[PDB]
Design a protein around this ligand. Structure first.
Ligand SMILES: Cc1cn([C@H]2C[C@H](O)[C@@H](COP(=O)(O)OP(=O)(O)OP(=O)(O)O)O2)c(=O)[nH]c1=O
Ligand SMILES: Cc1cn([C@H]2C[C@H](O)[C@@H](COP(=O)(O)OP(=O)(O)OP(=O)(O)O)O2)c(=O)[nH]c1=O
Ligand SMILES: Cc1cn([C@H]2C[C@H](O)[C@@H](COP(=O)(O)OP(=O)(O)OP(=O)(O)O)O2)c(=O)[nH]c1=O
Ligand SMILES: Cc1cn([C@H]2C[C@H](O)[C@@H](COP(=O)(O)OP(=O)(O)OP(=O)(O)O)O2)c(=O)[nH]c1=O
Ligand SMILES: [Mg+2]
Ligand SMILES: [Mg+2]
Ligand SMILES: [Mg+2]
Ligand SMILES: [Mg+2]
Ligand SMILES: [Zn+2]
Ligand SMILES: [Zn+2]
Ligand SMILES: [Zn+2]
Ligand SMILES: [Zn+2]
Lengths: 163, 158, 165, 171
């Protein structure tokens, strides 16, 4: 078995790498699947959809490779990935390290300690136009988990993050 | 200006990175374009030198399968010198592991350069070379997995 | 300011990269320094390296250095906020540390550091058993207490299949 | 067998990575060696020997072949300087040997170094490092000679060359 990991802010190109990393295995004729967070499992166009990796476990039971965009949203992430890898399965996880508060996401960091490879990607800064490595919420909100595109958040460099 | 470069065999996930690298700039509200090679098996050309005129207003340019452009080097180059980000995806070597058409020359005037790995279609380990299945010759001949294989070293040898 | 980070097990080549990453800036005529924990068994050229147990002490003298290196960052409890604060003062902090222990448990409050870090990478060792990409550290002795220093005579860089005793 | 490759300008931190990459194997109890180029060589402030730690010295990889005949891993700072580079690395890898090569892609003229590029086509991994620019202090990716010289191969440290970004190179 084996575990990969990708992180960085948003607009990093995260989800995109993940898929690139998966196709690799699929195009070598591999049993590949993709879980992602829904916010209510449910198929799509290949790949599944859940809120807790622990449900799907049963069906993904025959796939060698598993991808997961937005891993942090699964509370049962860590032990899932882990256990799965221990069963000879390649788990490629894409997720955000930190929140709009630059605080570690839901029990996600813990994942990077039992991970064979880990990398952190860089976005371009939407302010000063240099290597963005952090995500910033535009609205004056609170509650950790709230989904959006660039109409809601910004990939910023350090100097830009500060208000 | 500035130049990026991505290489490796086929099935490396090359074209896919390229786009990922582009969207990054586009999703920061940039003038992005993509050239790619035509009459095979975003714009479309056979010589970067034609298109020059229209891409004249784009800050970022992508090019899957760069090697196919003879006028590659000096195009990318010149463009970068005009403040344009040129992200190129191409193959370093042929099915003969020989350098592609004047492509290597590009990697000397390139700010960043990386080589990707495929999975081997034989022993299922890190494939880093491309191999033609048919008993053919002529360098340039387009195909998918029905024609080529991403193989490790031990596998490449006939 | 700006923060780099390097992790992975032991024999990864961690400390070694760190230095490489530093010289880069130094050889561009930069104010460079290296903090490290009371430990090991480093090179040559110019203004370089201190020694502490708490980054918070040294703060005063490194006060004039643009770049700071730290092999074995996890050993500093006051790591996070130090690196952080420093970076906020326009200083480049390149940290080398271990993500996980011999129990593959996150090291002392270290992970927290990787959330306020511009670049983060994890290196691979070679496995001392099956001779493939080792990504985890394993203690040879039948010990416990998290922090206990050693070289290959104590630990091993192992792949997954090998980690399971 | 297997072949690694590192490039970029000077002050990139090339030679240093190479070693880091080697120790990895050595500290896993591997037969490791280091060739390097010699005839004008000092910097500053054939036959086996320590430092670089079990490392040799040559001008043509083809000589040493005989003794390195028993080493699984081989390192080579400044590969470009060996004309017989390509085929050496290559052949060696074909014999189950890990060849980690460090070299410069381009000259002070940003022209490909002596038959070096050819090497990167038969290479499992290849990466290009970045220096800091000695002028504008940003990612230097090219090497520039300070003197008003010509002849491709002429050895030196920062007292001779500079790691520069693009805008700075146009001297
Ligand atoms: C920062 C932040 C994001 N989110 C949400 C918004 C997004 O839907 C998601 C993060 O998006 P990503 O995982 O970055 O989306 P992506 O796959 O497009 O990757 P990238 O943009 O780098 O290429 O999490 C929160 O719910 N809370 C937060 O604090
Ligand atoms: C190997 C080889 C390929 N070709 C052709 C076949 C391909 O259609 C084309 C290059 O295709 P690719 O560049 O491999 O297309 P891709 O970017 O999707 O690859 P990847 O999956 O790694 O991302 O060149 C030759 O003409 N001669 C050759 O020797
Ligand atoms: C795994 C583990 C190691 N250690 C100790 C043993 C070592 O002295 C130290 C590890 O630091 P190292 O990674 O060995 O620092 P380094 O300079 O050797 O960098 P590298 O080898 O990657 O090139 O921490 C613990 O105290 N507890 C643990 O659980
Ligand atoms: C650019 C250039 C270098 N040289 C020489 C000078 C140098 O001593 C040698 C290459 O320098 P480097 O290989 O860069 O020396 P290094 O590996 O220790 O530096 P670093 O690792 O930090 O990148 O080649 C030429 O003869 N002609 C040239 O055009
Ligand atoms: Mg996103
Ligand atoms: Mg392809
Ligand atoms: Mg160590
Ligand atoms: Mg040098
Ligand atoms: Zn910015
Ligand atoms: Zn193979
Ligand atoms: Zn092993
Ligand atoms: Zn510059």
């Amino acid at each position: 078995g084996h575990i990969q990991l990708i992180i960085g802010p948003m607009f990093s190109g995260k989800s995109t790498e993940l898929i690139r990393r998966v196709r690799r295995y699929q195009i070598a004729q591999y049993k590949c699947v993709t879980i992602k967070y829904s916010n209510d499992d449910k198929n799509n166009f290949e790949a599944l959809e859940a809120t807790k990796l622990c449900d799907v476990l049963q069906s993904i039971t025959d796939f060698s490779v598993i991808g997961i965009d937005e891993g942090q949203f699964f509370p049962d992430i860590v032990e899932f990935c882990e256990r799965m890898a221990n069963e000879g399965k390649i788990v490629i996880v894409a997720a955000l390290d930190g929140t709009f508060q630059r605080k570690p996401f839901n029990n996600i960091l813990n994942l990077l300690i039992l991970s064979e490879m880990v990398v952190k990607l860089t976005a371009v800064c939407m302010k000063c136009f240099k290597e963005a490595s952090f995500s910033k919420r535009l609205g004056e909100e609170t509650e950790i988990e709230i989904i959006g595109g660039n109409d809601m958040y910004q990939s910023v460099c350090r100097k830009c993050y500060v208000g």
